[PDB]
Amino acid sequence: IFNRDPRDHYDLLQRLGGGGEVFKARDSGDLVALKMVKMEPDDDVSTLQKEILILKTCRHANIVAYHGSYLWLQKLWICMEFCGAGSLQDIYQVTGSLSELQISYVCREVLQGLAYLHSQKKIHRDIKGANILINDAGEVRLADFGISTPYWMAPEVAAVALKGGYNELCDIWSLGITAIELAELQPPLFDVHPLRVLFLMTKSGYQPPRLKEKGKWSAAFHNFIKVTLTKSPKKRPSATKMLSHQLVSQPGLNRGLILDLLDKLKNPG
Template structure:
């Protein structure tokens, strides 16, 4: 991994930029295949963190987790070469084409739940499920990304709030200093994500962990679909289960996978109608 990545890849346009660094589309000079390369500034302090995160991703073997193809450390930058998800993320999709149909929401729900079941069985909580972290391939296949907030279910639970406030489970925000949360916080985040995809807007317009904590301390109501007649009873039931306020009563990922909302005749892939120039991957 200690070699110049530009000997193997031609870096093309930047397709995403954030606090984590930048993601570029790139072409493998030997095979011609397109990939996504995540480039992060690297120091003596964070090298091992980046390396261990990459090794963990390499150890995952699930069809809905992008494959790591190469990794490099060069000139104080860490490069991770991964599968390119040219369809973009689900925020891009619904902002470009409008809210998703119920059958498409069901498809996303099933694919993400199957990925979470794999992670939970491995002993990990993702902790940052949201539309931005759900990508689509050109074929409309779902890929779950961004494992920077992931933690072990049993150990190493961070004693600080991490993740995106609008999607965080109430118990995670209210009890995080005691570490009193488990993998069911991912179920809540998925429920909030599905609400957003169905309605084309965030269910809760809260921008900070503090405001989110205040919201639940005041015992405000759990978000619901606004137009009840537009959606099937099965979808309402699924969301009520996923957004159960008491985590002890909230269904597990495994149980939700058996819900009637995810029956085979109700699932369709998300239409990829965005132009190539407007698609984004992370």
């Protein structure tokens, strides 16, 4: 970490989104994104610096690269890879749905980042359209919206309360949902209240979900979904195993497909 105003280092060009806040900035002259975070009177910096460590030993082209953090006047700024098309979700919300082939290259890329994260025995915890970033070159980058009364709780409740039951494999499942999300503009049950959906998922009966249209997608896309969305984590394939899958290993898959999508985003019709 460095402790200073980062307005010395970079020029703040423009504001991209709220949450904390993210800004396009320039260093070197090269373009970075600055995630700003307002910390309260209760917030202790000692703990965020253990999560900041985990971000500096994340080197992967399929991972939004972390460049170095800054503490300044009750504000924490994270410098970061700039992906100037935003997220897949800001993209389909304009372009409509993605093609099977587009969706397939996105899925191979995510798996590439995942496999490396699981390599490092980390877990993304939050795979979705909103956390997959697209540079002006149509390359794909998993971003970190996530990792970026206990006194009375017992140790078992405490443990489960940091870790969740998150297993590296729940990242796979989530990708499955993300593919459907990208196919159909919405994940399963977006028009169903979220508690109900959490309950529905735990009955001994719950069938994993699937694409609505059947004709419109290859048998390989169908298998991809069937196999990623296995209920049992013992039986769900690893990300290195999923990179074998025929949906993500077929020829033709390259940034060109997404370049198409970025044009589609400028010139509709």
